[PDB]
Structure 1
Amino acid sequence: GRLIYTAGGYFRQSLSYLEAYNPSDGTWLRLADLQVPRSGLAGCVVGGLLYAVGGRNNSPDGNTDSSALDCYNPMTNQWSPCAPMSVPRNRIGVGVIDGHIYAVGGSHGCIHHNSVERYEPERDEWHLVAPMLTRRIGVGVAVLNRLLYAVGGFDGTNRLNSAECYYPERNEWRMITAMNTIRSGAGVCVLHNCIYAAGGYDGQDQLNSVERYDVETETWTFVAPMKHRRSALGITVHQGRIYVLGGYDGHTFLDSVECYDPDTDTWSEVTRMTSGRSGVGVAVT
């Protein structure tokens, strides 16, 4: 009975919600608010704990990019602060390898980072690792075969179809085949040994298209598109299906949650969030 957690987000201002969806019975839990509102963050899980990484607090009274790392324990319904990153990272990407959290890219003001740093929960410390070949904000991250992939984003000048691969044992990055479509703000995840990139913004339109990367054929292939165009959607995988949550469709902040079934190559609407929002962090535990 693992749950889909969605933390933070944006609607008129950065949000503090933590809510958890149960796909088996369709219920939503309202859990402890974040201590500081944040949008453009990422979520991940290590050791059954949920982590909220990076983002920004955009409020009527100011706009502050976040270096914060905060840890939610489902057993206690409590957020605890952790050591902060070396730099604020709004529109960050995150992946986990061997129980370590990798924070990639994101922005601080107009600085678009290529830097990458790694968090060790047992010692509550961050350390920089090799930087990406490309500056990327609004970047999607996938972990596959104990390699970390950074997909798409915005380099400060252009939205990107490029993607690159981090080798943790070697501490180095290499460019891989570029996507079919330029995507900033896509949801990026791993399902059945392929990397999926769904939605995003190509510099003109919000996208409903979805493409997936086969690391051996080194080819991106379109699959069925989502029912809603969305950028800055949340994304996760639960019991062999992709879930996308919220995002902005060009006009409204969506509450729609769609579900992709790889066996039938179809998307379905499965639930709604309790309010529309974009820029959430999402993880499963």
Structure 2
Amino acid sequence: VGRLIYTAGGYFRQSLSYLEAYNPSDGTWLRLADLQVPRSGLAGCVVGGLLYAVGGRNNSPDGNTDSSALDCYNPMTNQWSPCAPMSVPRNRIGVGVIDGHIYAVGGSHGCIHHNSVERYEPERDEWHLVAPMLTRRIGVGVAVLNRLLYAVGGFDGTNRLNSAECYYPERNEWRMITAMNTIRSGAGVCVLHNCIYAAGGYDGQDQLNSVERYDVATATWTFVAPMKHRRSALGITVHQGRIYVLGGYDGHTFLDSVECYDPDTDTWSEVTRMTSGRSGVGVAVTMEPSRK
């Protein structure tokens, strides 16, 4: 019945295997089954109650490799299971879910900065390429609003981006929308109360604490209250009508801070500290694990 905030993987000196679940009510962190492979720069999402870990990169003292992997965690068994991999490795990926399908957007593979996009069908365990973005985007933020897919910011290999573009599944076409006020790579992007939020990131000079919100009806981005802590490569999710931001990098430290945005008051507050600081996590929300 209760839902937890799951954080998977991340980076602190090397990529991490942690899966931990935060209970915003009783404050606990539950330590769950490790990822099969340590990964940073991955994304998390939930479909049908199952948690998915998508893409990323294994930075290890034995060597570094970008990842095409898709893996699925079932809270009712506390077990990970592999899925079919993506067509290419995608480090610093963004993902969104439309109609029960997972869209993997952008990211990098070595020196390749992807504009390509592909779609996963859980009911067939198959990926299929769809139309590529207008822009190559690593560290791209992704959100779904009214069954359209939005790709926000990122880094094209040369320039960091304030542009955003919108994918129409029925047309299989990408269209540019209004750009953000601020250039951001590695921002946290999510949807809350029918608006897209973009929090934090890196503009090529500073890590950011500013937060802006996109309203489709007006096609305008508007600043809201900034986070307490500047952070790039943060994890973000929505739980019970509030945004949570987890970890990240502030130019000096890998943060363990978790901040929570209340839209009704337009206020951020620090609510917990992760068990260790890290950046580049995948985050999503689903039902708590079966006690056993």
Bin of the TM-score, shorter chain as denominator length? over 0.9
How far apart are residue 195 of structure 1 and its match?
0.4
CA distance in 1 between partners of 2:258 and 2:136 (Å): 30
Distance 1:88 1:32 in 2: 23
Deviation at 1:59, TM superposition (A): 0.8
Q: Distance in 2 between matches of 1:77 and 1:192?
A: 31
Structure 2 residue matching 1:102: 3-state secondary structure: strand
- Deviation track 1:49-101 (CA, whole Å, cap 9, x = no partner) reads 00000000001111100000000000111110110000000000000001000
* Aligned equivalents of 2:204, 2:65: Cα separation in 1: 25
The match for 2:175 is 174
CA distance in 1, matches of 2:90, 2:149: 18
CA distance in 2, matches of 1:225, 1:187: 13
Partner of 2:151: 150
Q: How far does residue 115 in structure 1 lie from its aligned partner after superposition? A: 0.3
The Cα offsets for residues 230-284 of structure 1, whole Å up to 9 and x where unpaired, read as 0000000000000000000110000000000001010000001000000000000
Tell me how far apart the structure 1 counterparts of residues 275 and 111 of structure 2 sit (CA, whole Å).
33
In structure 2, how many angstroms separate the alpha carbons of the residues matched to 1:216 and 1:154? 27
Query: Whole-Å Cα distance in 1 between the matches of residues 15 and 245 of structure 2?
Result: 19
SS at structure 1 position matched to 2:155: coil
2:221 and 2:259 map into 1 onto residues whose CA distance is 22
Q: In the aligned structure 2, how far is the partner of 1:25 from the partner of 1:16?
A: 24
For structure 2, list consecutive stretches of 5 or more residues without a partner in the other structure: 287-292
Residue-by-residue CA offset, 1:88-134 (whole Å, 9 max, x unaligned) = 00000000001000000000001000000000001100000000000
Distance 2:215 2:83 in 1: 36
Q: Aligned-pair distance for 1:27?
A: 1.1
Which whole-Å CA distance do the structure 2 matches of 1:123 and 1:282 have between them?
A: 24
Give the Cα–Cα distance (whole angstroms) in 2 for the partners of residues 82 and 196 of structure 1: 30
Shift of 1:24: 1.4
The alignment covers a number of residue pairs equal to 285
Q: Deviation at 1:22?
A: 0.8
Cα distance, 1:226 vs. partner? 0.3
Distance in structure 2 (CA, Å) of the matches to 1:184 and 1:82: 28
TM-score computed with the length of structure 1 as normaliser = 1.00
1:216 Cα deviation from its structure 2 partner: 1.2
CA RMSD of aligned residues (A): 0.4
- Rounded Cα–Cα distance in structure 2 between residues aligned with 1:276 and 1:242: 19
Shift of residue 135 of structure 1? 0.3
The equivalent of 1:277 in structure 2 is 278
Stretches (4+) displaced over 6 A: none
> What runs of 5+ residues in structure 1 fail to find an aligned partner?
none
Equivalent residue number for residue 57 of structure 2: 56
Q: What is the alpha-carbon distance in structure 1 between the residues aligned to residue 121 and residue 23 of structure 2?
A: 29
Q: Which residue of 2 aligns with 1:217?
A: 218
CA distance in 2, matches of 1:223, 1:123: 41
Distance in 2 (alpha carbons) for counterparts of 1:115 and 1:5? 27
Residues 20-53 of structure 1, C-alpha deviations (whole Å, 9 max, x = no match): 0011111110000001000000000000000000
Distance 1:144 1:218 in 2: 13
The separation in 2 between residues aligned to 1:261 and 1:187, in whole angstroms, is: 16
Whole-Å separation in 2 of the counterparts to 1:129 and 1:222: 32
State the identity as a percent: 99
